[PDB]
Nucleic acid binder design. Structure first.
Length: 49
DNA sequence: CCTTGGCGGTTTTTTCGCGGGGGTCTGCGCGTTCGTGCGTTTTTGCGGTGCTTGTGCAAAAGAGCGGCCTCGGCACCGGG
């Protein structure tokens, strides 16, 4: 989740960026208010410990 | 120093003695009944507590006020 909220929204945070390749799913995102702000990890991604 | 006990002599009189007479009352003994001890069983006044009680500690946009800027024009002051 990206905690940018609804107030002061902008299109740039919601967009699918080039650097998202391989780390988050390009297709899976909710509809409506949270579109683009909620992301799903790709199927081979990890988080450093 | 002056008096109030003491020591003596004498008289008073009842203490006390022996004797008597009487009756009271204390003690023995019998009969008993009721009074208290002894018992298993029980209570009121009180110690400790329950629970009822309550009071305390994030964009964008326009608008507005604000302070300041500038300026002109006036008025007090000057030259002459």
């Amino acid at each position: 989740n990206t905690p940018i909220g609804r107030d002061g929204k902008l299109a740039k945070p919601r967009q699918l960026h080039n650097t998202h390749w391989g780390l988050v799913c390009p297709a899976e995102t909710p509809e409506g208010q949270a579109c683009g702000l909620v992301k799903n990890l790709s199927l081979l991604s990890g988080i450093s410990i």
